[PDB]
User: What shape does this take?
Amino acid sequence: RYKPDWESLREHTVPKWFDKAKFGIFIHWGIYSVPGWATPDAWFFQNPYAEWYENSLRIKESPTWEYHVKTYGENFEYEKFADLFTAEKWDPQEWADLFKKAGAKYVIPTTKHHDGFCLWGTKYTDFNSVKRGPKRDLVGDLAKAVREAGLRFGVYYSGGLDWRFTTEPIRYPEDLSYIRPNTYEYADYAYKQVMELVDLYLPDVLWNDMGWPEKGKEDLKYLFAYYYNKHPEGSVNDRWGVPHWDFKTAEYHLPGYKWEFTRGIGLSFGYNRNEGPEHMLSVEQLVYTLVDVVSKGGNLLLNVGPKGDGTIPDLQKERLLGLGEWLRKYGDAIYGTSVWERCCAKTEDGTEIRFTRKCNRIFVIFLGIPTGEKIVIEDLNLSAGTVRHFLTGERLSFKNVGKNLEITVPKKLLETDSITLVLEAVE
Amino acid sequence: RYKPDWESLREHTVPKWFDKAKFGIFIHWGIYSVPGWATPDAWFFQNPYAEWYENSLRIKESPTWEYHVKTYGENFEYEKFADLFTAEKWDPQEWADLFKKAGAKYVIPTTKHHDGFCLWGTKYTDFNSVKRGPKRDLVGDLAKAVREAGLRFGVYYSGGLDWRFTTEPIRYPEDLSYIRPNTYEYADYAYKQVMELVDLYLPDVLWNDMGWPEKGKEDLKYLFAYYYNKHPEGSVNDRWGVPHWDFKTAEYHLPGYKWEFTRGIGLSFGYNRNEGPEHMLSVEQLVYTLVDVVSKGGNLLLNVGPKGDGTIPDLQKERLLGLGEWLRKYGDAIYGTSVWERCCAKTEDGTEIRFTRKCNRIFVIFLGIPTGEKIVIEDLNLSAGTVRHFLTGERLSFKNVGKNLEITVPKKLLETDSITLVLEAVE
Amino acid sequence: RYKPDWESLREHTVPKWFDKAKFGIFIHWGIYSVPGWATPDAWFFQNPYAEWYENSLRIKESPTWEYHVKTYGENFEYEKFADLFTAEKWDPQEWADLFKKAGAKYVIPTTKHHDGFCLWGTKYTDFNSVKRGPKRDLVGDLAKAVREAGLRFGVYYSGGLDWRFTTEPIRYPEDLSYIRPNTYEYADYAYKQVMELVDLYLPDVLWNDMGWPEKGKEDLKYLFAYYYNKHPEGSVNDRWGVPHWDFKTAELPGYKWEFTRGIGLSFGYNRNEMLSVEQLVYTLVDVVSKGGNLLLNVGPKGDGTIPDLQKERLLGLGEWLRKYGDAIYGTSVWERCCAKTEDGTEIRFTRKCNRIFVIFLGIPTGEKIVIEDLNLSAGTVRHFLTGERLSFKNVGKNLEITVPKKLLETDSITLVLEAVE
Amino acid sequence: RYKPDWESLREHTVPKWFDKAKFGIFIHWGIYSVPGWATPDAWFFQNPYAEWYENSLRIKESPTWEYHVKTYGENFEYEKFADLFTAEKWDPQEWADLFKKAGAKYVIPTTKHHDGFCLWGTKYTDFNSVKRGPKRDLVGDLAKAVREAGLRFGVYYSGGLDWRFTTEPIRYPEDLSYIRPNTYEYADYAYKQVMELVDLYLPDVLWNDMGWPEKGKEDLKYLFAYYYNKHPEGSVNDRWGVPHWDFKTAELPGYKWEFTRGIGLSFGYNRNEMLSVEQLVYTLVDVVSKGGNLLLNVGPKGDGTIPDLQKERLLGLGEWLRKYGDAIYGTSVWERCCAKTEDGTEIRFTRKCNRIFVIFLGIPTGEKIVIEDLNLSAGTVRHFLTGERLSFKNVGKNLEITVPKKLLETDSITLVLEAVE
Ligand SMILES: C[C@@H]1O[C@H](O)[C@@H](F)[C@H](O)[C@@H]1O
Ligand SMILES: C[C@@H]1O[C@H](O)[C@@H](F)[C@H](O)[C@@H]1O
Ligand SMILES: *[C@H]1O[C@@H](C)[C@@H](O)[C@@H](O)[C@@H]1F
Ligand SMILES: *[C@H]1O[C@@H](C)[C@@H](O)[C@@H](O)[C@@H]1F
Assistant: This one.
């Protein structure tokens, strides 16, 4: 039983389901999705994250302001996007089904992003999807659908930033230090809202962003204790600005700790019209990224930015479904695995290789499919055992040659693989 | 003049009236009195304190939950008891008169217990007796009546616990560390409410329970300074979780400091139907307890748990009135006394003895009436003086025999006493 | 048992012996006693406290600097007075006995004053009376003598100020906010020294001066708990800078406190310098009537003798106390401290159970006495010394009492009456 | 690289070797070993821990005070035991080898226990084993021997308690809240000594006891970062009083922890005083099944020999561990620790990938075994030693297994089964 102090909360280790899940879907959706626009040390003047629309708009003359004055006019307050956000083509079951086939094991929507708009029927502000726009509990309906599809549900909350409590935009990164809600009122609000999400939706992940208000950091002792005692399988990210977390997050990419890399299929998290497939990962690069991350002990949290009407952009769909097809073939070498002696190796040709492990098995995942039958892996040796082609299970001849390892794979099997050659060695 | 720091507030010593009062009446009354039910390390699963009804009810399947689903049904929220709490047979003057005859010198009702329901017309919540239930300022009406009877009035406030601000029950004692209001809002609320009680009712005791919110502990510097500067005769208990108090409290029973033992006539504080006179102190044991406590420097705060309709249970009445009859006879040996060289002694027969002191006089109070004329007190010697039978004032022969003291008391006088033989020695 | 937190240490109320004591003796004695000299918002430039000699000397061209540069020389360091401090005629038994006769109930010597010189054989500095000067544990020998005479023994310690750790003089009051040892080393040193006084001598009073080093204030919850648990009748003044004290100090309250002053002005002996016996009595009575103890300072000489003038006044106090002590010892405050007669004579009150002692600061010259703005419901007023019942009457707002001249002439210094109620 | 803040130090998870080790040896050895005596809410008055000898001795008239005033004399100071502590028959290689044979994977000696005596050549006190007694770096020579035998080496340090800094004995538990060194000087000393252990010996475990001085707790974020950066496979217990630990200690959790106890009751050697080999095995298994390591204490004699009784039991453990070690080393917890047969025999579980080891605390006498309130979906259950497949069946809430008597008779102390799923 967890007590509200850091020493006791350290007893809560990362839950097993999270280490085994490997792949989760982030969803950045809100009233910013309605305009759904961003540009192609002044990152905040030329912000490619469309979720940040309100911030960009508050910086007058920026590319986001100039786009806004054309489309909606100068007297359109950012706040009015909430009435246009009717999510009328939204089918939460379709989303859930899409995420399942993508091969995702958990799903995490933005319940409240930096703009302060809440995607549930919170008692603590009318600025929410039940009283405005969709007239719908979006978070609850999505949780229901996610779990009907057999998946786990978590919640994102923008604890550290809420532009309902500020009027001034972030122009440079140092503006983050002081352009914050700052009040005791806000500290209470954020604590009350995350408590509300815990009690209403029992999420398996609490995914905070942008730190936590200084005045509320001691409250997290109590929130984490409460959450873990009610829901021990629950897990917490590392963006709270306090000594406790269950896993770490990265956005720019062997650790003995659990972590999670998150990016969008493109550059933005929120839907961005102005993006296009030249800034987007191919199915191939998405598979390589997932494989690299997993070989290094991480989970991939891949983001989807839906349109204001509740449809997921065609490109995004295609990439998720292609990722899912790869995972349907090669999932055994990803789900439920642990890191091996090292993440990485390479062939003589220059093909990168990644290792995962399930018990005695070490999966050898090639980021690419070699052209010839003679594959030579550098700096690697294997004791006596059996090496097999993963997809067909076909036995393979292998030998140790100096410090390298020569494996011989029939062309017939190579032509069978998709994106990655995968082998499998039982020592 | 008191300043808001601990060093200065230490100048406020326990007021004289409190050391001299000896006997006070606690009143545990609220919407929990309406169901008025509790059971005969899992103390919170089988809670015999009926005031804790809401907590017990929130623990589903507990004896309190199962009782509730029969009597009121499953869709009866705890909060609905507030509308049934009409206190329609309440006569505050009868209560006050009863407390006077019981021999009490101060009276302290629960103004707000753990359930958060307020027995006065507070401006800071509608969850109170003026807007709901009785449609009456219960605290003000009772203070008025208590003081018309010549008694002192104090207030109990549940500062540390308020289940209006939590939804989750306390299952084990460690749940107390984190299942608390926790907010800055709550710290303000509690400070504002006790300030309100001070200004409205000018209580001679501030009786806090369950500690004080961590975020509000520095406020108590200001509250105590304010209270003492406005009302210097005022006094404060030791349940605030800060370095200052006027007296200490005990619930499980020679100190150089002032303290106060509190218990119910039975086991529960709030009315409990399910109790009955086998868990209740007799008049005899109530007198012995009072005498023991007073000989050790304490006051007894004896609790009464009224029914929802505002009547005090017959048993409770009988015991108070019997206590009062004893105090009408033997009050001189209790009221206004100080502790002697030691609290205690015993006879050859095994009868416990207790000492109190008024100036040069040392009262010798026997917890029982010995059968024979020759009483022998162990380990006690008296210099030359006069020993008298207390009730009749009759002179008595006494002598020092070794380390013991032989006193000879006529049977005629012994038959005169009630419950306790009391003697009286002027050295 | 006490725990090292303030909420627990509050259970330690002022011990009853201290409440009842009423009168104690301070002793300001050290190497500053050797020169024993002070002057006849520039208080530190012209300091009349002889104990502050080192500070005054560090202020160039001050009256003390001038005296020192004539009598001892400019290159005579103050610390060398330690070699001249021999205490050749010191008899702690004489001291103990004089204090007993004066009516005192406790005795408190300076174990270490601001100059940092220690009057016991401490292990944390060589700048002490065992290694230097007298070659004697002055604190230990006085404690034994004081206790053998039946008096309580306490200790003064200059925790907040130690001029072995600072070079710069205090010139103005604000200088006290920063010219302090300031180091962690000093915080440990002070803690270790008071613990040593506790372990060695188990004093009945811990009398700190000038605050406690900021870095060491959290040590005090442990020190107090340790002290109280070894010695529950011990007591602590209020010059430590923390939530807990047993009595306040000053140089009707509900709380216990203590007024301190010298028989003259300087605490340490001053040759270049006094309350009459009358004035000492009036002061005692005044202080007691307001809930206080008087802590009266004697400043002995380097050779350990208390000057005749001081010896004589303590004895005069003691004779008054032999006569009227029942109106002083073991008393508590009445509903007020003070009153006045129609002819301007001050009155003070004390209480013992049912008796109320009425102590006139003077002996009125007339039989008919009118006390202003007082009534009594007691039913007898008596002359205290004989208990003889007197005729009195509440007349409007005043109280009229007839004391026969024969009874007035029996009193010494103070007319004392006594209402039995 | 780790930074000196708690949020960063949390990246240092419990090292995998410690998770897999399961069994370590504590060694309580010092000058208290010389007298080596303890008694047969007054726990400190009648202390059975021989290591606490100095504390017990400081309590006048206690059983230890009496023994000391007969055997050594009243004026024999405890610190003089340092001269009698010569460790003449000490062979760290013998120690290293016995521990290896016992199946232990790490070894942790007391470098400094509560008495403040240091078993290495520390530069911050002369009260150590190089300047006194053995004239030898005991910590350094044991570390070399332990590592040469292929075992991990850690260090115990009594940070929270050091009786060279306190005079007053612990008499009741609450005394631990204030009878502590308490000074800044001690905070530096402890920090400097643990840094010295890190610099000199790079231990694999830092095993603090009795908390860390309050004034030094902020030093620990720097010490841990420094330690981890020099030695990433290092580890830290949970008796420092700060947010960061690698494992908890005790004398199904998701976290790593460690149970510690002696082969007998006293940690330090006690002449005036034991688990059978069976009991040690059951304890190991019990602890491991709940996610723990067992840290088993030996208390050697002043001459450096471990008594026969202790040598024999460690070896008995080691033989059991040679047989059944695959069910212990490198395992993780299953979905629960424990179960019981219908006839009252306790069961414990461990896990290695797909295999689930079923370890009976006893050898059941019958072929037909019924485990209460358990089912398995695994599809084969085997006798562990041979891997022989057994007949089993889920029957309602229970699990029925037939073990042929021939297979029961092959096991030593524990019947072990094994579900491959
Ligand atoms: C009693 C008196 O206290 C003051 O604070 C000191 F400055 C002075 O020297 C003397 O010790
Ligand atoms: C391992 C054990 O730990 C306790 O905390 C100590 F008090 C004891 O002496 C021994 O060292
Ligand atoms: C914090 O981090 C990520 C997850 C995005 O939500 C970004 O917009 C926010 F600033
Ligand atoms: C605190 O203490 C006593 C006075 C009762 O009110 C109890 O119910 C509460 F928990």
Summary: The first helix of chain C runs from residue 6 to 9. Chain C has two domains: 1-329, 330-421. The pocket of 2-deoxy-2-fluoro-beta-L-fucopyranose (ligand 3) is lined by residues A 49, 51, 209-210, 262, 269 (CB under 6 Å). DSSP finds twelve helices and 16 strands in chain C.
